[PDB]
């Protein structure tokens, strides 16, 4: 017998945009300085925000359907030549009401 307990959950909310640039979301930290690369500001109006998917302090790990490693310049660049459709896919590490 001995402590261990697994409790690693994570939910993935694909925000799928539609429209164009400029949609009005940026990001903050990288690998670059060890932070988790996560929303820091999106313009509350425009696509983004319209889209009510994410909000600043979701980690966005996946643009335009590219698997990013931490990075954050390939990231910000990805978007810089958006679509007519935006596809990313942010992770959110819920907690609170879960014992452990």
Not at 29 to 36: A, D, F, K, T, Y
Not at 45 to 74: C, F, H, W
Request: glycine share 16%; with cysteine; charged share 20%.
């Amino acid at each position: 017998g001995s402590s261990g307990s697994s409790g690693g959950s994570f939910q993935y909310v694909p925000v799928q945009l539609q429209g164009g640039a400029p949609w009005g979301f940026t990001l903050k930290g990288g690998l670059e300085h060890c932070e988790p690369l996560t929303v820091s500001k999106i313009e509350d109006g425009g696509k983004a925000a319209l889209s009510q998917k994410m909000r600043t302090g979701d980690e966005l790990v996946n643009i335009n359907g590219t698997p990013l490693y931490g990075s954050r310049q390939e990231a910000l660049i990805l978007i810089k030549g958006s679509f007519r459709i935006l596809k990313l896919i942010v992770r959110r590490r819920n907690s609170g009401p879960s014992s452990g």
